[PDB]
């Protein structure tokens, strides 16, 4: 990172800190638990969780008597599944393989960009100091032009790769927003969309 800082390469902090995103998710979960699906369609109307789950059961072609008779079993299955996912997440796993992949991609791109300076691009040397201390101005112009063209090409390549990666991440973020709208704030009838 020190070389990146000394070569003008910096990382701007995100606008929303982790605490704000955690607050947003806690608010969403509280709204889902208390008001159910309604808080996404306008005003938030409170509903007992049992009745909300009865409506959600009705939404998939199962009468609500099933839940009111098997509430203990359904709650136990809910809790057991939550504990199972908890343990699955805590046992070293690749569950977060996409996020680590994007982090690694950004780090590798920056490292390649900074390491590209070592290449002399067919000039006398890859360093401006020795070129300027060895070759006079008029002759040094050619070497300076060579190095400048090479480094500008490196910057352009990095920028284009970043643009394409940003397009892919925007596609993923739009899909995530749609999933939040349709699965969290309401019940989704699309097959295999929300699980």
């Amino acid at each position: 990172i020190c070389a990146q800082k000394f070569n003008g390469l910096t990382v701007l902090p995100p606008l929303l800190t982790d605490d704000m995103i955690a607050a947003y998710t806690a608010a969403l979960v509280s709204g889902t638990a208390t008001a159910g699906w309604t808080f996404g369609a306008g005003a938030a109307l409170q509903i007992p969780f049992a009745m909300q789950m009865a409506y959600r059961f009705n939404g998939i072609g199962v009468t609500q008597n099933v839940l009111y008779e098997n509430q203990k079993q359904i709650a136990n299955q809910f809790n057991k599944a939550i504990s199972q996912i908890q343990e699955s997440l805590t046992t070293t796993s690749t569950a977060l393989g996409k996020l680590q992949d994007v982090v690694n991609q950004n780090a590798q791109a920056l490292n390649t960009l900074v390491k590209q300076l070592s290449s002399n691009f067919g000039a006398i040397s890859s360093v401006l100091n020795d070129i300027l201390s060895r070759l006079d101005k008029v002759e040094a112009e050619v070497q300076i032009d060579r190095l400048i063209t090479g480094r500008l090409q490196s910057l352009q390549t990095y920028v284009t790769q970043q643009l394409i990666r940003a397009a892919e991440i925007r596609a993923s973020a739009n899909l995530a927003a749609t999933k939040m709208s349709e699965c969290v704030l309401g019940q989704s009838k699309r097959v295999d969309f929300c699980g």
Binding site: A3, F6, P14, L16, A44, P48
Partner: protein, 260 residues
């Protein structure tokens, strides 16, 4: 130049890093290792409410711990460097903006959940962002809220559908009207031919985009003469026969957007 603890070999005279940057050097007369760092140091950003509004601005140093890294060998101070109105933003030192405990919406983002704006008091004020309107929700095991009335809400969604179709010329741009330049350019191959192919593909794609978005009705249904359907006034969204072919809202939309 600054003193350094770097370990140099007995014969070494200078050392560099992975990016071939000479970050250390030996003093030939005293043989002391000196580290050398750039002067820019990277990251200074300026926050301005607009020269039209005011000439006052604020300065954010991205990773300084509110110190004088921008070596103070310049008149004035660069708005100031380590003045009085200093705020220590997470990953940054901000100078020239007043910190207010009250939190508002974000106007000029800074980062780490901190935003700045040109509030009245008139000066630049920095604050923590507001997530949303706090709400009190009461959970009850035997009570529900049901709506007793309803309202009709009409919301707008703007979606770009096409972009301007552009075309370029090989010689008229690269060379112009010079025969010698055209001859020299012929030796570079088929670059501009493939550029023209890409541009043509983009233009055809734009035409297809518009056609697929709009051409979804196989029948051009006639505009009704009576534009009231059980009290619903559609005359604002349907064309006016007296005028020309666009509806009033369409005219407003075309006028709103301004199309060497």
């Amino acid at each position: 130049l600054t003193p350094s603890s770097k370990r140099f070999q007995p014969f070494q005279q200078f050392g560099r890093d992975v990016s071939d940057f000479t970050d250390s050097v030996r003093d030939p007369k005293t043989s002391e290792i000196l580290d050398i760092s750039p002067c820019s140091f990277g990251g200074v950003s300026v926050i301005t409410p607009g020269t039209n509004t005011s000439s006052e601005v604020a300065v954010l140093y991205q990773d300084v711990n509110c110190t004088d890294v921008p070596v103070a060998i310049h008149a004035d101070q660069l708005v100031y460097s380590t003045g009085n109105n200093v705020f220590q933003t997470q990953a940054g030192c901000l100078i020239g903006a007043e910190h207010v405990d009250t939190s508002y919406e974000c106007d000029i983002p800074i980062g780490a959940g901190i935003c700045a704006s040109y509030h009245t008091v008139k000066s630049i004020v920095a604050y923590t962002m507001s997530l949303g309107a706090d709400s009190s929700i009461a959970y009850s095991n035997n009570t529900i809220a049901i709506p007793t009335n309803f309202s009709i809400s009409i919301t707008t969604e703007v979606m770009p559908v096409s972009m301007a179709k552009t075309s370029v010329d090989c010689n008229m741009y690269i060379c112009g009207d010079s025969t010698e330049c055209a001859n020299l350019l012929l030796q570079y191959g088929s670059f501009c031919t493939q550029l023209n192919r890409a541009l043509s593909g983009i233009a055809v794609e734009q035409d297809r985009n518009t056609r697929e978005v709009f051409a979804q009705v196989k029948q051009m249904y006639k505009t009704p003469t009576l534009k009231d359907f059980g009290g619903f006034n559609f005359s604002q969204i349907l064309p006016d026969p007296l005028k020309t072919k666009r509806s009033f809202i369409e005219d407003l939309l075309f006028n709103k957007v301004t199309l060497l």
